[PDB]
RNA sequence: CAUCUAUAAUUUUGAAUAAAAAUUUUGCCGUUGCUAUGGC
């Protein structure tokens, strides 16, 4: 009964670069920092945009794991 | 053939239905109805039939059940979907058939049809858990035995009408296909204190919210069979939970007497505490008596996105709004004072005067608790129930800064565990059917001084206009 | 076995009766009868 | 094995507060307080299963 | 004209402190709950103090006990509801008597001592 | 879920036993009668 849970926060528009930028919340019980490629897929589908068009960098995994 | 023109034509049939009903009502309005309908998804309370119901002549009926201690019920109502106009009902034969689900402490699960407002809920099917499901191993990694073996506590049907989920002290969630009433999956809760206490689905969704005695609210996604999130923060047990469409839930955690509203997506719980002050209350009434303290908190549900109602254990019924931390308005012993125990019994002695002087008068009087509290979403009418055998219907003041008594229904007899609401008929005249699961005992323990002459059953209240 | 069980039950109930029947200012045969009938119905349950 | 509500704590000099004093409990991801057992239990059970199967 | 055989009995605030302390105690197993449990703690000399209810039928079942309490110098209180006491002590049937036991290795220590002194002041 | 079979009402021979074409309040116990209810 485990599965990644994806959330956005501080969604900010950016017409200057024609983009949206924000912080991503990735709850993951029984997992080790769900990989960036799948994250790209899931955010891309959520925001309806293109897979390689969405981009993500720079995670940290809180001590004790899970988030 | 095309999806686009399929939607177009279906919304057409919707629209000539609308205009035909406009002609009917005339024998503007279209836009107003459309605005109400769509804006349902957001905003404050808007259904304003508080003064429209015809309460005194409500058709009242009671039905017995073949077992004891009906602890919970939940009614599911397929709705003409406003997004895509087929239905909320899944199968063609369902065609908008109204369903009721009952769970009883005898490890009893029942599916009733309630499609008619005159006749009684017809027992479509039943299932029984037994001791033949006790897991032989105790590691609890495999609590995967597919039947109940200890004290079902509550039930809720996924508002898509496909599955029904039930939970009890046996630290498991059991999800069943509706029409066969068949156990499709077990979800262990995986903890030794983890008796499930209450369940609620997020409206029109797949999310399920299990308030667990592990001080926690576990949160699941049904059709993915997944445990989404496990939120923390209460002090003692969590007792009641309810929600609406938005990713918000409300839980009263009892003994620490706190009422928390969890906004999930941003991961934040706003906290409410009661705490009426008896000395101030008595002096305020001297400014012109029995003022009981909030021992615990038991039952909560939300009318809307910003206001909600809380049931104490000492008669207090409170309207809270998100902004002010205190309850914006509060109501006293409303379910009335529980009777004075018999003099002869309480004394165990011959001198009637000794019996009275041991009754000690007022200092022994005690209030009715609050057992079932519920509201129709975004309405301005809410229903309160105790074991006084009398449901109390209340209307929120259209200011949303108070509420008043609308009326009484004396069809109940015994402990009112759960209240649920169904609506049918046309929009102009909606026929309400309120279903009250009544048992002889409380939901959780027995704890109750053998209330006189009660029956495990269903109390149906059909109200018109 | 059942003998010990019913005996212990009666022991508890007579402790009850003694408690009330001492500490009151006067006793209550009817309340005693209530306890008697309760124990009798349990014995019948056997 | 024992965590303060959300975080897992392996720091036995916490200096708890009152809210914490209530929230301390077993940790959701540790075999005393949650999911599948630890490695020595798994090894012993595996040895039992192997010796019984042979 | 005579005080009733239940005196003392607490006001609602003191009811709150008593029941809450009882609940935490029952969750931390410093608590012997049950009338005979109470009498036997009193005998064994390991009791911090004694709560009991003043609505059980009859009242004399537990009215016996404060005799032991007064002789042994331990305080006692009557809360106005066995039902409430049961729901707060965490068992299935109404409870009419309970005893909070001694042990200083108690994470509710100061709580219980303050409440006990409140009781002593009530008397 | 849909289909199909049978059960439950019709279409027809028909008075129909009958042969034929299609369709779609209770675990126990007690009180009450033109459904209501009480006790465990």
Residue E73 structure tokens? 């110098």
- Give B131→chain E minimum CA distance, Å: 21
Measure B387 CA to F8 C1' (Å).
42
Chain E residues with CB under 8 Å of C23 CB are 60, 63-64
- Whether the CB of B423 is less than 7 Å away from nucleic strand F comes out as no
Closest CA in chain B for residue D19: B235
Protein residue nearest nucleotide F1, by CA to C1': B91
Q: Which nucleotides of F are covered by protein (CB under 7 A)?
A: 1-2, 25-27, 35-40
The residue assigned the tokens 């068009």 is: A53
D24-26 and D2-4 beta bridge pairing: antiparallel
Dist. CA B167–CA B133, nearest whole Å: 15
Question: A61 vs chain B: nearest CA distance in angstroms?
Answer: 17
Residues of D in contact with A62 (CB under 8 A): 7
Spatial distance between the Cα atoms of B400 and B319, rounded to a whole number of angstroms:
9
Q: Which residues pair with B101 in a beta bridge?
A: B74, B111
Task: Mark residues 261-280 of chain B whose C-beta is closer than 7 A to nucleic acid strand F.
Answer: none
Chains that touch B (3 or more CB pairs under 8 A): A, C, D, E
- Contact pairs from chain C to chain E, CB under 8 Å: 15
Contacts of B395 (CB under 8 A, 6+ apart): B50, B51, B380, B381, B403, B404, B406
The answer to whether the CB atoms of B215 and D25 lie below 8 A apart is: yes
Q: Give the long-range contacts of residues B394-402, CB within 8 A, separation 24 or more.
A: B394/B317, B395/B50, B395/B51, B396/B45, B396/B50, B396/B303, B396/B307, B396/B319, B398/B48, B398/B50, B400/B44, B400/B45, B400/B307, B400/B319, B400/B321, B401/B319, B401/B328, B401/B329, B402/B319, B402/B329
SS3 B345: helix
CB-nearest to A3 from B187, B224, B265 is B224
Contact between E112 and E101 under an 8 Å Cβ cutoff? The reply is no
Cβ contact, residue pair E93, B295, below 8 Å: no
From the list B221, B230, B265, which residue is nearest A7 (CB)? B265
Tell me the CA–C1' distance in angstroms for B92 and F5: 21
Contact list in E for residue C28 (CB cut-off 8 A) is: 58
Distance between CA atoms of B439 and B417, rounded to whole angstroms? 7
Q: Are B164 and B178 in contact (CB under 8 A)?
A: yes
Q: CA E61, CA D21: separation in Å to the nearest integer?
A: 38
Structure resolution, Å:
4.6
Q: What is the DSSP letter of B194?
A: -
In 3D, which of B390, B373, B370 has the Cα closest to residue B313?
B370
Cα B273 from chain centroid (whole Å)? 21
Query: Do B309 and B318 contact (CB within 8 A), yes or no?
Result: yes
Two structure tokens written together for B125: 């099917």
CA quadruple E85, E86, E88, E90: dihedral positive or negative? positive
Domains and CATH numbers, chain E: 1-123 (3.30.1330.30)
Classify residue B180 by burial, with Cβ atoms within 10 Å: 0-12, 13-18, 19+.
exposed
Angle ∠(B187,B193,B197) on CA atoms, nearest 5: 65
CB atoms within 10 A of CB A36: 12
Residues of B within 8 A of D33 (CB-CB) are 191-192
Is the minimum distance from the CB of B330 to strand F below 7 Å?
no
Helix crossing, B3-26 with B29-39: angle to 10°? Answer: 120
- Cβ–Cβ of A27/B228 closer than 8 Å? yes
Q: Which of residues 164-183 of B touch strand F (CB under 7 A)?
A: 179-180
Chain E residues with beta carbon closer than 8 angstroms to that of B445 = 86-87, 91-93
Nearest nucleotide (C1') to the CA of residue B180? Answer: F1
Phi then psi dihedrals of residue C30, to 5 deg: -65, -40
Vertex B101: Cα angle to B98 and B104 (nearest 5) = 160
Rounded to the nearest angstrom, the minimum Cα separation between B443 and chain C is: 27
In chain B, what's the furthest Cα-to-Cα distance? Answer: 89
Chain A and chain D share a number of CB contacts under 8 A equal to: 13
Strand order in the sheet with B238-243: B238-243, B248-253, B258-263, B268-273
Mutation target for C interface from B342, B344, B348: give the one with most C CBs within 10 A: B348
Question: How far: B93 CA to F23 C1' (Å)?
Answer: 16
Which chain A residues are within 8 Å of D5, Cβ to Cβ? none
Q: Which nucleotide is nearest to B62 (CA to C1')?
A: F25
What angle (nearest 5°) sits at the alpha carbon of residue E58, between those of residues E53 and E61?
Answer: 70
Burial of B220 (C-beta count, 10 Å sphere; 0-12/13-18/19+): buried
């Amino acid at each position: 009964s485990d599965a990644v849970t994806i959330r956005t926060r501080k969604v900010i528009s950016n017409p200057l670069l024609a983009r949206k930028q924000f912080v991503v919340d990735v709850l993951h019980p029984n997992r080790a920092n769900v990989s960036k490629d799948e994250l790209r897929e899931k955010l891309a589908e959520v925001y309806k945009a293109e897979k390689d068009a969405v981009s993500v960098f720079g995670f940290r995994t809180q001590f004790g794991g899970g988030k | 053939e095309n999806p686009a023109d399929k939607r177009r034509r279906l919304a057409k049939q919707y629209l000539e239905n609308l205009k035909s009903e406009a002609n009917d009502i005339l024998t503007d309005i279209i836009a107003s109805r459309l605005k109400e309908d769509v804006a349902e998804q957001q905003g404050r309370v808007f259904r304003y039939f508080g003064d429209k119901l015809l309460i005194s002549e409500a058709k009242q009926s009671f039905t017995r059940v073949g077992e004891n201690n009906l602890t919970c019920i939940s009614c599911f109502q397929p709705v003409l979907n406003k997004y895509t106009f087929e239905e909320s009902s899944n199968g063609d034969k369902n065609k908008g058939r109204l369903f009721a689900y009952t769970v009883s402490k005898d490890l009893q699960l029942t599916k009733y049809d309630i499609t008619d407002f005159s006749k009684r809920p017809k027992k479509l099917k039943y299932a029984k858990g037994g001791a033949k499901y006790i897991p032989t191993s105790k590691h609890e990694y495999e609590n995967t035995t597919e039947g109940h073996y200890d004290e079902i506590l509550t039930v809720a049907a996924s508002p898509d009408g496909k599955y029904v989920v039930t939970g009890g002290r046996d630290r498991k969630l059991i999800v069943w296909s509706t029409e066969s009433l068949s156990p499709v999956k077990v979800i262990p809760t995986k903890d030794r204190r983890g008796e499930v206490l209450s369940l609620a689905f997020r409206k029109n969704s797949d999310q399920l919210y299990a308030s667990c005695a592990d001080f926690k609210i576990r949160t699941y996604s049904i059709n993915q069979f997944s445990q989404l999130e496990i939120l923390y923060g209460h002090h003692d047990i969590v007792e009641d939970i309810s929600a609406l469409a938005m990713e918000r839930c409300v839980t009263v955690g009892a003994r620490d007497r706190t009422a928390m509203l969890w906004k999930i997506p941003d991961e934040t719980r706003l906290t409410f505490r009661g705490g009426d002050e008896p000395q101030k209350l008595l002096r305020r009434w001297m400014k012109e008596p029995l003022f009981f303290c909030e021992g615990s908190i038991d039952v909560v549900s939300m009318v809307d996105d910003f206001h909600f109602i809380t049931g104490s254990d000492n008669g207090n019924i409170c309207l809270w709004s998100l902004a002010k931390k205190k309850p914006i308005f509060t109501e006293r012993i409303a379910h009335g004072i529980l009777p004075e125990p018999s003099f002869n019994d309480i004394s165990g002695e011959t001198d009637e005067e000794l019996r009275k002087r041991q009754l000690q008068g007022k200092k022994l009087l005690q209030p009715f608790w609050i057992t079932s509290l519920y509201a129709i979403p975004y309405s301005n009418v809410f229903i309160s129930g105790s074991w006084s055998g009398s449901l109390k219907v209340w209307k929120i003041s259209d200011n949303l800064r108070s509420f008043e008594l609308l009326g009484e229904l004396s069809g109940a007899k015994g402990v009112v565990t759960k209240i649920q609401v169904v609506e049918s008929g046309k929009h102009g005249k909606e026929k309400f059917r309120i279903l009250a699961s009544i048992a002889k005992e409380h939901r959780l323990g027995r704890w109750i001084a053998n209330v006189s002459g009660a029956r495990n059953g269903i109390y149906s209240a059909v109200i018109d206009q | 076995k059942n003998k010990g069980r019913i005996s212990r039950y009666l022991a508890n109930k007579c402790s009850m009766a003694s408690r009330i029947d001492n500490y009151s200012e006067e006793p209550s045969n009817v309340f005693g009868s209530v306890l008697k009938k309760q124990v009798e119905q349990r014995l019948e349950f056997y | 094995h024992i965590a303060v509500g959300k975080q897992i704590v392996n720091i036995p000099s916490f200096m708890v507060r009152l809210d914490s004093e209530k929230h301390i409990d077993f940790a959701p991801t540790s075999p005393f307080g949650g999911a599948r057992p630890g490695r020595v239990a798994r090894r012993n059970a595996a040895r039992k299963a192997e010796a019984s199967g042979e | 004209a005579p005080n009733p055989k239940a005196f003392p009995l607490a006001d609602a605030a003191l009811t709150q402190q008593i029941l809450d302390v009882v609940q935490q105690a029952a969750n931390l197993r410093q608590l012997k709950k049950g009338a005979n449990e109470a009498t036997k703690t009193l005998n064994r000399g390991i009791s911090e103090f004694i709560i009991m209810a003043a609505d059980c039928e009859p009242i004399e079942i537990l009215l016996h006990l404060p005799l032991l309490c007064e002789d042994k110098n331990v305080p006692y209180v009557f809360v106005p509801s066995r039902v409430a006491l049961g729901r707060a002590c965490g068992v299935s049937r109404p409870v009419i008597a309970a005893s909070i036991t001694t042990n200083d290795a108690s994470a509710i220590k100061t709580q219980i001592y303050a409440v006990k002194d409140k009781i002593e002041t009530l008397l």
